Amino acid sequence: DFPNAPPNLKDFNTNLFGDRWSYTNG
Amino acid sequence: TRTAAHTHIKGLGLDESGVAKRVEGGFVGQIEAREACGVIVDLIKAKKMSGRAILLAGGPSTGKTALALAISQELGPKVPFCPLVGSELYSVEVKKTETLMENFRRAIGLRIKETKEVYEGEVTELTPEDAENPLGGYGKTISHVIVGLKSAKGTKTLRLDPTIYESIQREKVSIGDVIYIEANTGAVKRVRSDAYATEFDLETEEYVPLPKGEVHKKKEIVQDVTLHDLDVANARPQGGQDVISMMGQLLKPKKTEITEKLRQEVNKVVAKYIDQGVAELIPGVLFIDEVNMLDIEIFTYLNKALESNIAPVVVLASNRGMTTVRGTEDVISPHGVPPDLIDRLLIVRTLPYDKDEIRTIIERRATVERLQVESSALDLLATMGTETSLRYALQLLAPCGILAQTSNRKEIVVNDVNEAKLLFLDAKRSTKILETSANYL
Amino acid sequence: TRTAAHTHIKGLGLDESGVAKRVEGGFVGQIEAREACGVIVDLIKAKKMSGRAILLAGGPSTGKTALALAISQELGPKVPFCPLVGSELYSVEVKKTETLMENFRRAIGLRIKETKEVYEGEVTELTPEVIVGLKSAKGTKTLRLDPTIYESIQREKVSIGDVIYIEANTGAVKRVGRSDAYATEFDLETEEYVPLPKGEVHKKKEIVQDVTLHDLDVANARPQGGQDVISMMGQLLKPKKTEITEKLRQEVNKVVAKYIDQGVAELIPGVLFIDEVNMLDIEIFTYLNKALESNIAPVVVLASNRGMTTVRGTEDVISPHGVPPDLIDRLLIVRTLPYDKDEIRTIIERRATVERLQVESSALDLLATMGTETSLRYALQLLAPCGILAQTSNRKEIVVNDVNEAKLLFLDAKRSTKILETSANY
Amino acid sequence: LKSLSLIAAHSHITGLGLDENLQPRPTSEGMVGQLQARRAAGVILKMVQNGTIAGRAVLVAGPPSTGKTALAMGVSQSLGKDVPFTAIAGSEIFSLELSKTEALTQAFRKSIGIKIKEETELIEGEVVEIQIDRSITGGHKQGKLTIKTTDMETIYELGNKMIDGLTKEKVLAGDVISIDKASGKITKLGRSFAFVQCPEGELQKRKTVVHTVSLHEIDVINSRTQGFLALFTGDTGEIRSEVRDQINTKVAEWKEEGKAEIVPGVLFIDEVHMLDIECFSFINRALEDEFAPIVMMATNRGVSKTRGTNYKSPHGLPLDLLDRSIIITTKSYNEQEIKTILSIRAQEEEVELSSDALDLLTKTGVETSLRYSSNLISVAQQIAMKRKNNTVEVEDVKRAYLLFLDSARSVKYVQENESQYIDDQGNVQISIA
Amino acid sequence: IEGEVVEIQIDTGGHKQGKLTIKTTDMETIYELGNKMIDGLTKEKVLAGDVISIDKASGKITKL
Ligand SMILES: Nc1ncnc2c1ncn2[C@@H]1O[C@H](COP(=O)(O)OP(=O)(O)O)[C@@H](O)[C@H]1O
Ligand SMILES: Nc1ncnc2c1ncn2[C@@H]1O[C@H](COP(=O)(O)OP(=O)(O)O)[C@@H](O)[C@H]1O
Ligand SMILES: Nc1ncnc2c1ncn2[C@@H]1O[C@H](COP(=O)(O)OP(=O)(O)O)[C@@H](O)[C@H]1O
Ligand SMILES: [Mg+2]
Ligand SMILES: [Mg+2]
Ligand SMILES: [Mg+2]
């Protein structure tokens, strides 16, 4: 099971910009 | 541009086949001593012997220290060169023997030179590569990681072992800011960038420009360390919140007599490393002037120390005749050095000067001090040097120049040197004043 | 085996009447000195006097150090015996008098009895307050523990299934190791396994451990705590020894007196031996003079080989054996006499037979004549080179040729001085 | 293997150079002449190697530049490694943080070794497979590996610390690995592929390792909790006597039972003529201990004043210490012996000499000291090399002789130019006119 | 940078809306904020009415 994409790549994407930056990206 | 009793000495003024020119490298006269020091310099550059000792002797103001400084200059800044006065060995914290051994080891140097392969640049993109699992399984399997790097004039994408993933995870690499990776050892180092520096309103993250040239880089790094640095680093601790660090910070760690075991371990590891061709050994020079101030115990320990197999070359300066060695009252020796140590080293004589040599010395020193003097005062200065002393004439130059500048002149004349004679005295006239006065003078 | 200038001396060799036999216990001659030493030994065994001070005076190579060692060996391992040289009193971090008093306290001993409570076994649970569910091979019990011992437990990285060993008196904690029950958890598991301890979890033992007064004085003078980090850093804060106030000594004396009064301990005074007292200076002599007139001081024996010489630290104060007259007045002097030819021969024979060597009669007589002509110690020391020279020729018995070659190879003091005087370059 | 070294003063000697029956050859192993002293040194070496006699002091006396230091170096070289040999100077005892007796005790104890043997198991091979399972936000991990040899091939599953031990040093499928079960220590012998042959034989093996340590180190370790650091920083002060008293008995029981074996060594004291009378008395008392090594002292003084006193004694030592010592004397050198010494010294420094130059060097080492010509050899070679001919001739030797002065010539120059230099009363004349 | 009389404006998720005003006698302007900037700001809290200083050297914001 993979809840959202490759989970390792998922956390990589999260640390690309940050949690708040991820929220405000859209 | 500040001058102090030196800096007009640039080498020994030697020549191929080891013959010293009469006037070269700020040197005049002293041909034999310069030739001997050149032979010593060649022996140093051979880097084969160990613990060779020479003592250069002569009267005061005869260029005894200038010779050692000249050989240090000729040897080059690469080789270590440790200067020392004989009175520095008496330390309150540690015994004189350990201080002597520390200064003895500080003269030996080690050059570490090695190459590194680097991929450094700005991240273009990064992506795992899904592939079939090697074993039976139901899930994504990453067999490679593709990372693209762009720098000035260069761009390249690379496929890498996926296990390095944690290196990105720990490094908080992000995308497009920076990257700098080593080739073989793996791992990644995060060195933001000027491309997005002005994009944000304000940010507490530093920015570096695009790396220059091809992403792939060959770098050769060379450094030099004295063995004393290795010993003191091995003995002294390091770290953060450990109890030993707190103890060291709270104790003012004065010097301690480093044990022989640590020195032997350092020697063994250094020998192993130079066996691999990554390191090179460079014996240096230990210069000690005014050795007459050394105690007999230090001389006795020097006798044993000179016979070690990692000893540097020690040069000694002294200006004493038949004198009693310090620490004793019945041994009278030449140069204040015990005969047993004298038997272990090579003597280098040093002769006084002639009036013409003194005149040339004064002219050169005046030229190096940005002053203009004609012969009508240069002859008087030479006569003063021959009458009072050479060093007195050397010192009198600057007051003469200041007096000339006061009178809105440019050239030093006889009147200026006479006025400087009247104002400042030498030792002989001071003693004559002292003897003829009976007012506690 | 290993021999070093001794170990052929096994006691004073006295009988019940105290009369010294001519040859007994690795001793020949020295009858009067041996009898006096035996009297002093009996006086020490009486455990009544305090501060008695004797010195034995004689020329070099007469057995003073041998006599002191024989006294110590005859007294027995139970009684403490502190040997010292005059040069040890010049320390670096403390004054000389403090070091002398430290040795004085070290000289006497105290034998005490104590009860030690011990827990051990496998650990079933570990819940913070700490509660430990110990379980032995027969019994199970839960214990409540202090935060410090809990910290020591944590630093031991203990877990469920680890047989451990706690001591109640000191709080010392040691993890014995993983229990044998979980012996199948990893095919290459590095951890060692131990069977569960036998008996109940709580045990009590009675021990008769000895101590010295200086030991329990330095116990509260400066600690050596153990596994606690706070104690470690406290003992690391001060790394140098210091002078002890007399108040600590008085409190120690009161505690020890209470202990011995309670019928739990007994006191055994010891001996303090000082070889080469001539190295002491006037200040140490005065302080020792003052400290001898105390109520706890042990028996002190001194050794010296001097004539009428000047006391160190003074300019013109001359005295016999280099000892101030005031300290001499409160001293008991034991004379020591030189030896004769037959005594030297017998000593050489004893030293040969202890070193498992065979010496023929002619070689022994030559060695005795040499010893009379040069010195006794030189003849004693020349035995081993003779043995090796005999061995090199594939032999076992020392021959006249061997001692002659040893004479040729090695020189004594007289010939060395003769060759020193008649030479140009030093 | 060979440690860091250069061409030292005594680098040309390796052992005493004796026969099977302690007969010294005229020239062997870098030692020339002095047959009596060499045979005595061989006898002392046999005494040390037997390991039964303890606390023997032997004194080597002779004029300067005679061979006593060379004799001690040869004894140390012939004794080989694994036998302690602590060489110190007479002035090293004085210290600002340790008393003279304490430093002497440390020097004495530094030259007795203790060797403890222990048996270790190993599993060595080439990694065939490794599977590792990390539970994210989980506290436990699941490991397994498959390891083979040329004959065996077996799988194992690992606990907790095995996984981290394997992960700190990256272990891959192309590696050769050795594992110690007791310690769990990783050892990488090389990557087979992807320059070392595949490990052969059984998958597991047993071996023995010896830990050798000086008695002084054991003494230092148990003194204080931090005393271990003093093994390197050298900051330990006045270890209490009871520590040594207990450690001696503990070593005795260890030797008696059979866990460890002790090896006595040699303590060499150079320039022993300078030492306080306190140190001499302490040595007199401490020579009698059972745990005492053979002490070799070197001296070159005649009837001189002993430090710390006001009377003169032979060799600078008191008669008390001289009484319990054995003296070996060294004699001056023949001209042929001097020539041979110069020849071997020149051969050591890979310097080619001409016969006439060698004869002139022998003559100048006969008139002056031998060390003068021995030093002159290298500078003569340097001059010859600068002249571009790789052979030392008489001209280069004479150039070096005139360029670098001798003690006698320097003394004569000072005596005839007394006014130039600073005398003992501080009066100098710097002005030429 | 000095004169941080701000009256901050921070309300997505994880403390979004990273903006704050800056006023002085002759200047007045609104600055947007980054993740690290607000992470620094939350420590050493600014009451939004206190003159505060901050450097552009990517260092630490100093209370005045
Ligand atoms: N040949 C020379 N060339 C240049 N300067 C010299 C020469 N000889 C002596 N000097 C001068 O003499 C001074 C050195 O004095 P020195 O002889 O070293 O004193 P000491 O011998 O007491 O150490 C220097 O300031 C240097 O300028
Ligand atoms: N009665 C004796 N029997 C055997 N050996 C003796 C006797 N007396 C002295 N010795 C030996 O003489 C040596 C010197 O003795 P010691 O007391 O250590 O020094 P000193 O006698 O000079 O004070 C010792 O090694 C000891 O073995
Ligand atoms: N028998 C020998 N064989 C080789 N070299 C010797 C011999 N004797 C003396 N030397 C040399 O003479 C020099 C002086 O050393 P030595 O005489 O041992 O010390 P010291 O001068 O303190 O007596 C040493 O460099 C040594 O190489
Ligand atoms: Mg100078
Ligand atoms: Mg004695
Ligand atoms: Mg020597």
PDB file of C-alpha atoms in Angstrom, chain D residues 164-350:
ATOM      1  CA  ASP D 164      23.227  -0.814  13.162  1.00  0.00           C
ATOM      2  CA  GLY D 165      26.689  -2.349  13.402  1.00  0.00           C
ATOM      3  CA  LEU D 166      26.325  -3.451   9.783  1.00  0.00           C
ATOM      4  CA  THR D 167      24.888  -0.096   8.646  1.00  0.00           C
ATOM      5  CA  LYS D 168      27.473   2.352  10.058  1.00  0.00           C
ATOM      6  CA  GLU D 169      30.030   0.770   7.687  1.00  0.00           C
ATOM      7  CA  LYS D 170      28.243   0.144   4.390  1.00  0.00           C
ATOM      8  CA  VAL D 171      28.154  -3.611   3.765  1.00  0.00           C
ATOM      9  CA  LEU D 172      27.255  -4.626   0.207  1.00  0.00           C
ATOM     10  CA  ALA D 173      26.983  -7.889  -1.714  1.00  0.00           C
ATOM     11  CA  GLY D 174      30.476  -7.662  -3.216  1.00  0.00           C
ATOM     12  CA  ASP D 175      32.311  -7.373   0.098  1.00  0.00           C
ATOM     13  CA  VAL D 176      34.419  -9.704   2.230  1.00  0.00           C
ATOM     14  CA  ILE D 177      33.490  -9.468   5.905  1.00  0.00           C
ATOM     15  CA  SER D 178      34.865 -10.868   9.167  1.00  0.00           C
ATOM     16  CA  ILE D 179      32.724 -10.804  12.318  1.00  0.00           C
ATOM     17  CA  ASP D 180      33.747 -11.334  15.946  1.00  0.00           C
ATOM     18  CA  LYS D 181      30.796 -12.703  17.915  1.00  0.00           C
ATOM     19  CA  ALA D 182      32.061 -11.459  21.286  1.00  0.00           C
ATOM     20  CA  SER D 183      32.604  -7.835  20.227  1.00  0.00           C
ATOM     21  CA  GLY D 184      30.491  -7.511  17.076  1.00  0.00           C
ATOM     22  CA  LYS D 185      33.275  -5.636  15.281  1.00  0.00           C
ATOM     23  CA  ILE D 186      33.024  -5.007  11.540  1.00  0.00           C
ATOM     24  CA  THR D 187      36.128  -5.726   9.457  1.00  0.00           C
ATOM     25  CA  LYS D 188      36.262  -5.101   5.700  1.00  0.00           C
ATOM     26  CA  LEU D 189      38.859  -7.234   3.912  1.00  0.00           C
ATOM     27  CA  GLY D 190      38.020  -5.924   0.435  1.00  0.00           C
ATOM     28  CA  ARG D 191      35.515  -5.979  -2.419  1.00  0.00           C
ATOM     29  CA  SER D 192      35.725  -9.192  -4.441  1.00  0.00           C
ATOM     30  CA  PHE D 193      34.080  -7.618  -7.503  1.00  0.00           C
ATOM     31  CA  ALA D 194      31.756  -4.834  -8.676  1.00  0.00           C
ATOM     32  CA  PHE D 195      40.796  -7.477  -5.840  1.00  0.00           C
ATOM     33  CA  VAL D 196      40.686 -10.112  -3.087  1.00  0.00           C
ATOM     34  CA  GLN D 197      40.262 -13.858  -3.523  1.00  0.00           C
ATOM     35  CA  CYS D 198      37.172 -15.465  -2.040  1.00  0.00           C
ATOM     36  CA  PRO D 199      37.649 -16.666   1.563  1.00  0.00           C
ATOM     37  CA  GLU D 200      38.110 -20.425   1.829  1.00  0.00           C
ATOM     38  CA  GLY D 201      37.748 -23.135   4.445  1.00  0.00           C
ATOM     39  CA  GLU D 202      35.214 -23.330   7.241  1.00  0.00           C
ATOM     40  CA  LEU D 203      32.727 -20.504   7.733  1.00  0.00           C
ATOM     41  CA  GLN D 204      33.991 -19.978  11.303  1.00  0.00           C
ATOM     42  CA  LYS D 205      37.445 -20.134  12.862  1.00  0.00           C
ATOM     43  CA  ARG D 206      39.228 -19.571  16.165  1.00  0.00           C
ATOM     44  CA  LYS D 207      42.393 -17.647  16.968  1.00  0.00           C
ATOM     45  CA  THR D 208      44.405 -16.194  19.842  1.00  0.00           C
ATOM     46  CA  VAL D 209      45.267 -12.543  20.480  1.00  0.00           C
ATOM     47  CA  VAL D 210      47.827 -11.217  22.967  1.00  0.00           C
ATOM     48  CA  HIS D 211      47.353  -7.913  24.773  1.00  0.00           C
ATOM     49  CA  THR D 212      50.691  -6.594  26.047  1.00  0.00           C
ATOM     50  CA  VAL D 213      50.836  -3.619  28.405  1.00  0.00           C
ATOM     51  CA  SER D 214      53.379  -2.059  30.733  1.00  0.00           C
ATOM     52  CA  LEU D 215      53.030  -2.435  34.490  1.00  0.00           C
ATOM     53  CA  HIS D 216      53.066   1.362  34.743  1.00  0.00           C
ATOM     54  CA  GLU D 217      50.000   1.490  32.490  1.00  0.00           C
ATOM     55  CA  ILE D 218      48.086  -0.948  34.713  1.00  0.00           C
ATOM     56  CA  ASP D 219      49.135   1.155  37.698  1.00  0.00           C
ATOM     57  CA  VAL D 220      47.886   4.345  36.020  1.00  0.00           C
ATOM     58  CA  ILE D 221      44.550   2.858  34.929  1.00  0.00           C
ATOM     59  CA  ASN D 222      43.392   1.866  38.423  1.00  0.00           C
ATOM     60  CA  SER D 223      44.555   5.065  40.159  1.00  0.00           C
ATOM     61  CA  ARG D 224      41.527   7.191  39.213  1.00  0.00           C
ATOM     62  CA  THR D 225      38.493   7.003  36.951  1.00  0.00           C
ATOM     63  CA  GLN D 226      39.994   9.634  34.632  1.00  0.00           C
ATOM     64  CA  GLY D 227      43.495   8.165  34.962  1.00  0.00           C
ATOM     65  CA  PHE D 228      43.030   6.411  31.622  1.00  0.00           C
ATOM     66  CA  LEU D 229      43.320   9.796  29.901  1.00  0.00           C
ATOM     67  CA  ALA D 230      46.642  10.295  31.696  1.00  0.00           C
ATOM     68  CA  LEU D 231      47.961   7.438  29.549  1.00  0.00           C
ATOM     69  CA  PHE D 232      48.162   9.995  26.715  1.00  0.00           C
ATOM     70  CA  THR D 233      48.024  13.491  28.221  1.00  0.00           C
ATOM     71  CA  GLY D 234      50.697  12.479  30.729  1.00  0.00           C
ATOM     72  CA  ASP D 235      48.905  14.334  33.541  1.00  0.00           C
ATOM     73  CA  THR D 236      48.963  12.013  36.549  1.00  0.00           C
ATOM     74  CA  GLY D 237      50.208  13.077  39.952  1.00  0.00           C
ATOM     75  CA  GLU D 238      51.659  10.932  42.740  1.00  0.00           C
ATOM     76  CA  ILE D 239      49.722   7.687  42.469  1.00  0.00           C
ATOM     77  CA  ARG D 240      49.077   6.400  45.978  1.00  0.00           C
ATOM     78  CA  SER D 241      51.256   3.577  47.272  1.00  0.00           C
ATOM     79  CA  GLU D 242      48.401   1.183  48.065  1.00  0.00           C
ATOM     80  CA  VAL D 243      47.512   1.058  44.360  1.00  0.00           C
ATOM     81  CA  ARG D 244      50.972  -0.271  43.494  1.00  0.00           C
ATOM     82  CA  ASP D 245      50.901  -2.580  46.517  1.00  0.00           C
ATOM     83  CA  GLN D 246      47.638  -4.175  45.386  1.00  0.00           C
ATOM     84  CA  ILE D 247      48.582  -4.284  41.696  1.00  0.00           C
ATOM     85  CA  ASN D 248      51.815  -6.163  42.458  1.00  0.00           C
ATOM     86  CA  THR D 249      49.920  -8.871  44.339  1.00  0.00           C
ATOM     87  CA  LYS D 250      47.258  -9.059  41.625  1.00  0.00           C
ATOM     88  CA  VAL D 251      49.926  -9.529  38.947  1.00  0.00           C
ATOM     89  CA  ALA D 252      51.534 -12.191  41.143  1.00  0.00           C
ATOM     90  CA  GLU D 253      48.278 -14.157  41.377  1.00  0.00           C
ATOM     91  CA  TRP D 254      47.657 -13.765  37.638  1.00  0.00           C
ATOM     92  CA  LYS D 255      51.103 -15.180  36.861  1.00  0.00           C
ATOM     93  CA  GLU D 256      50.760 -17.978  39.427  1.00  0.00           C
ATOM     94  CA  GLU D 257      47.400 -19.154  38.088  1.00  0.00           C
ATOM     95  CA  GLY D 258      48.445 -18.867  34.443  1.00  0.00           C
ATOM     96  CA  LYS D 259      46.314 -16.159  32.840  1.00  0.00           C
ATOM     97  CA  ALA D 260      49.207 -13.810  32.036  1.00  0.00           C
ATOM     98  CA  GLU D 261      52.981 -13.893  31.700  1.00  0.00           C
ATOM     99  CA  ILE D 262      55.420 -11.177  32.743  1.00  0.00           C
ATOM    100  CA  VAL D 263      58.517 -10.093  30.827  1.00  0.00           C
ATOM    101  CA  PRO D 264      61.220  -8.032  32.566  1.00  0.00           C
ATOM    102  CA  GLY D 265      63.001  -5.380  30.560  1.00  0.00           C
ATOM    103  CA  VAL D 266      65.918  -2.949  30.801  1.00  0.00           C
ATOM    104  CA  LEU D 267      66.021   0.635  32.069  1.00  0.00           C
ATOM    105  CA  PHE D 268      68.854   2.662  30.532  1.00  0.00           C
ATOM    106  CA  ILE D 269      69.886   5.938  32.179  1.00  0.00           C
ATOM    107  CA  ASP D 270      72.219   8.121  30.124  1.00  0.00           C
ATOM    108  CA  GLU D 271      74.250  10.913  31.731  1.00  0.00           C
ATOM    109  CA  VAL D 272      73.465   9.500  35.173  1.00  0.00           C
ATOM    110  CA  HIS D 273      76.308  11.569  36.647  1.00  0.00           C
ATOM    111  CA  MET D 274      73.854  14.440  37.203  1.00  0.00           C
ATOM    112  CA  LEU D 275      71.178  13.368  39.714  1.00  0.00           C
ATOM    113  CA  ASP D 276      70.343  14.466  43.237  1.00  0.00           C
ATOM    114  CA  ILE D 277      71.521  12.420  46.210  1.00  0.00           C
ATOM    115  CA  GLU D 278      67.846  11.785  46.985  1.00  0.00           C
ATOM    116  CA  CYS D 279      67.466   9.961  43.669  1.00  0.00           C
ATOM    117  CA  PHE D 280      70.605   7.928  44.377  1.00  0.00           C
ATOM    118  CA  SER D 281      69.278   6.847  47.780  1.00  0.00           C
ATOM    119  CA  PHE D 282      65.885   6.001  46.281  1.00  0.00           C
ATOM    120  CA  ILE D 283      67.574   3.876  43.608  1.00  0.00           C
ATOM    121  CA  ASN D 284      69.630   2.185  46.332  1.00  0.00           C
ATOM    122  CA  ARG D 285      66.442   1.184  48.127  1.00  0.00           C
ATOM    123  CA  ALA D 286      64.381   0.342  45.024  1.00  0.00           C
ATOM    124  CA  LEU D 287      66.996  -1.904  43.395  1.00  0.00           C
ATOM    125  CA  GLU D 288      66.134  -4.617  45.936  1.00  0.00           C
ATOM    126  CA  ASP D 289      62.477  -5.010  44.898  1.00  0.00           C
ATOM    127  CA  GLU D 290      61.396  -8.253  43.243  1.00  0.00           C
ATOM    128  CA  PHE D 291      59.590  -6.319  40.469  1.00  0.00           C
ATOM    129  CA  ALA D 292      62.731  -4.436  39.416  1.00  0.00           C
ATOM    130  CA  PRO D 293      64.287  -4.536  35.925  1.00  0.00           C
ATOM    131  CA  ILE D 294      67.964  -4.532  35.032  1.00  0.00           C
ATOM    132  CA  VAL D 295      69.303  -0.973  35.288  1.00  0.00           C
ATOM    133  CA  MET D 296      72.099   0.146  32.955  1.00  0.00           C
ATOM    134  CA  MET D 297      73.657   3.522  33.765  1.00  0.00           C
ATOM    135  CA  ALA D 298      76.143   5.413  31.594  1.00  0.00           C
ATOM    136  CA  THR D 299      78.717   7.926  32.821  1.00  0.00           C
ATOM    137  CA  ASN D 300      81.785   9.734  31.505  1.00  0.00           C
ATOM    138  CA  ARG D 301      82.912  11.761  34.547  1.00  0.00           C
ATOM    139  CA  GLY D 302      86.033  11.252  36.626  1.00  0.00           C
ATOM    140  CA  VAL D 303      86.284  12.176  40.308  1.00  0.00           C
ATOM    141  CA  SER D 304      83.535  14.804  40.210  1.00  0.00           C
ATOM    142  CA  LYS D 305      81.185  16.561  42.616  1.00  0.00           C
ATOM    143  CA  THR D 306      77.909  14.731  43.194  1.00  0.00           C
ATOM    144  CA  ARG D 307      74.922  17.046  42.839  1.00  0.00           C
ATOM    145  CA  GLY D 308      73.125  17.909  46.060  1.00  0.00           C
ATOM    146  CA  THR D 309      76.297  17.601  48.160  1.00  0.00           C
ATOM    147  CA  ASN D 310      79.675  19.299  48.564  1.00  0.00           C
ATOM    148  CA  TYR D 311      82.148  16.398  48.237  1.00  0.00           C
ATOM    149  CA  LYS D 312      83.677  14.758  45.174  1.00  0.00           C
ATOM    150  CA  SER D 313      83.264  11.055  44.410  1.00  0.00           C
ATOM    151  CA  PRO D 314      84.318   8.796  41.525  1.00  0.00           C
ATOM    152  CA  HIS D 315      82.021   8.852  38.482  1.00  0.00           C
ATOM    153  CA  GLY D 316      79.970  11.479  40.307  1.00  0.00           C
ATOM    154  CA  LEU D 317      78.103   8.728  42.182  1.00  0.00           C
ATOM    155  CA  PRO D 318      78.086   8.046  45.939  1.00  0.00           C
ATOM    156  CA  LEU D 319      79.967   5.031  47.245  1.00  0.00           C
ATOM    157  CA  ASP D 320      76.697   3.557  48.549  1.00  0.00           C
ATOM    158  CA  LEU D 321      75.289   3.057  45.048  1.00  0.00           C
ATOM    159  CA  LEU D 322      78.710   2.083  43.688  1.00  0.00           C
ATOM    160  CA  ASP D 323      78.942  -0.691  46.290  1.00  0.00           C
ATOM    161  CA  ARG D 324      75.910  -2.534  44.859  1.00  0.00           C
ATOM    162  CA  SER D 325      76.816  -2.029  41.185  1.00  0.00           C
ATOM    163  CA  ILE D 326      78.869  -3.792  38.516  1.00  0.00           C
ATOM    164  CA  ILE D 327      81.225  -1.669  36.410  1.00  0.00           C
ATOM    165  CA  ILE D 328      82.110  -2.187  32.742  1.00  0.00           C
ATOM    166  CA  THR D 329      84.936  -0.018  31.414  1.00  0.00           C
ATOM    167  CA  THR D 330      85.552   1.141  27.847  1.00  0.00           C
ATOM    168  CA  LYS D 331      88.925   2.041  26.336  1.00  0.00           C
ATOM    169  CA  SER D 332      90.075   4.443  23.624  1.00  0.00           C
ATOM    170  CA  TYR D 333      90.220   3.546  19.927  1.00  0.00           C
ATOM    171  CA  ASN D 334      93.128   2.467  17.755  1.00  0.00           C
ATOM    172  CA  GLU D 335      93.812   4.240  14.471  1.00  0.00           C
ATOM    173  CA  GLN D 336      92.694   1.174  12.508  1.00  0.00           C
ATOM    174  CA  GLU D 337      89.510   1.011  14.585  1.00  0.00           C
ATOM    175  CA  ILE D 338      88.871   4.700  13.865  1.00  0.00           C
ATOM    176  CA  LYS D 339      89.354   4.075  10.141  1.00  0.00           C
ATOM    177  CA  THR D 340      86.931   1.137  10.245  1.00  0.00           C
ATOM    178  CA  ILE D 341      84.349   3.207  12.144  1.00  0.00           C
ATOM    179  CA  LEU D 342      84.624   5.997   9.579  1.00  0.00           C
ATOM    180  CA  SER D 343      84.312   3.476   6.743  1.00  0.00           C
ATOM    181  CA  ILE D 344      81.158   1.861   8.129  1.00  0.00           C
ATOM    182  CA  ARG D 345      79.628   5.260   8.930  1.00  0.00           C
ATOM    183  CA  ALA D 346      80.295   6.439   5.370  1.00  0.00           C
ATOM    184  CA  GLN D 347      78.825   3.203   4.010  1.00  0.00           C
ATOM    185  CA  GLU D 348      75.677   3.783   6.082  1.00  0.00           C
ATOM    186  CA  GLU D 349      75.072   7.213   4.508  1.00  0.00           C
ATOM    187  CA  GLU D 350      75.569   5.718   0.996  1.00  0.00           C
TER     188      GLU D 350
END
